[PDB]
Structure 1
Amino acid sequence: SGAKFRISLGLPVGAVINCADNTGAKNLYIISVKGIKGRLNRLPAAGVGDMVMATVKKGKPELRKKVHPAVVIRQRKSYRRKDGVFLYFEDNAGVIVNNKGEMKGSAITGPVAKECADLWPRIASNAGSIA
């Protein structure tokens, strides 16, 4: 397969990111990061391609007071792509998925990081284009 290399994290717990899908949500409030053991006082952080748990603060009322899986697809902190490219995006954004990784929405607004696209196939199939 080939796992994702490490990237600069940038987005800790408490961050509010855009929701790029078409579920009617507006933003995701990251409440945790999947697969992070942690350390004393170290806030759990997530980069692109990571799965987070989030609650939407704005959006359709049937989505708001619930916890949802999500995957970060664009981040504003620059990350190295193991070939010299220090790439960063204009905004922090993610999409809402389920546990198996299927995207709850059906279209993705804006670009999607290559790490996210390679880690998740169905996100890639919904992606407008890859940056």
Structure 2
Amino acid sequence: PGKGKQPLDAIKNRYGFTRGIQVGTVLACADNSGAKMLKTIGVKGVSGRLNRLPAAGPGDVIVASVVKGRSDMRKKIVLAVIIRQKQMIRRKDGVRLQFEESAAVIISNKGDLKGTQISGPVLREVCDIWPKISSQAGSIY
């Protein structure tokens, strides 16, 4: 539900994959918007329990701050979608996948993309729930 600053209006179904990315993780930005590295500060949809750090998998929306990028863009808070992950995932058909490096892509409150082109490969399941990503990805797996 939409509360606080930077609310999200476009909620989607989670997949139950392993959660490789958590608060504290620094990861690359894959789009052409001008950010380069993002530092993870929160995850949408997490209600929390004692002593556990919030974590995310592919398809989930993270809150992050821009730690490398153009001057206009640094030290600001932003929303992004996780498109690939280095931790292993299992499909319901039993196939297992693993990428070389993790990455995310920046979005608006309405779920629209910030940039126009995405570097490198993207996970098939993400393109099923975020249809706009299908248009501008490098390859689908």
Counterparts of 1:1-131 in structure 2, within 5 Å, are: 3-131=13-141
Which ranges of structure 1 fall in alignment gaps of 5 or more residues? none
Tell me the SS of whatever aligns to 1:118.
helix
Whether contact under 8 Å (1:50, 1:116) holds in the other structure is no
Counting aligned pairs with the same residue, the percent is 55
C-alpha change, 1:18 and 1:72, in structure 2 (3 Å) is: same
Q: Tell me the C-alpha RMSD between the 2 structures.
A: 1.3
Deviant stretches of 4+, over 4 Å: none
Tell me the SS of whatever aligns to 1:114.
coil
Q: What is the alpha-carbon distance in structure 1 between the residues aligned to residue 15 and residue 56 of structure 2?
A: 13
Whether contact under 8 Å (1:4, 1:119) holds in the other structure is no
C-alpha change, 1:108 and 1:120, in structure 2 (3 Å) is: same
Tell me the SS of whatever aligns to 1:31.
strand
Q: Which has the larger radius of gyration?
A: 2
How many corresponding residue pairs? 130
Shift of 1:4: 4.3
Which ranges of structure 2 fall in alignment gaps of 5 or more residues? 1-11
Q: What is the alpha-carbon distance in structure 1 between the residues aligned to residue 46 and residue 105 of structure 2?
A: 20
Tell me the SS of whatever aligns to 2:72.
helix
Structure having the higher helix fraction is 1
Q: What is the alpha-carbon distance in structure 2 between the residues aligned to residue 53 and residue 4 of structure 1?
A: 17
- Return the TM-score normalized by structure 1: 0.93
1:42-78 CA-to-partner distances (Å, cap 9, x unmatched) read 1110111111111111011111111001001010000
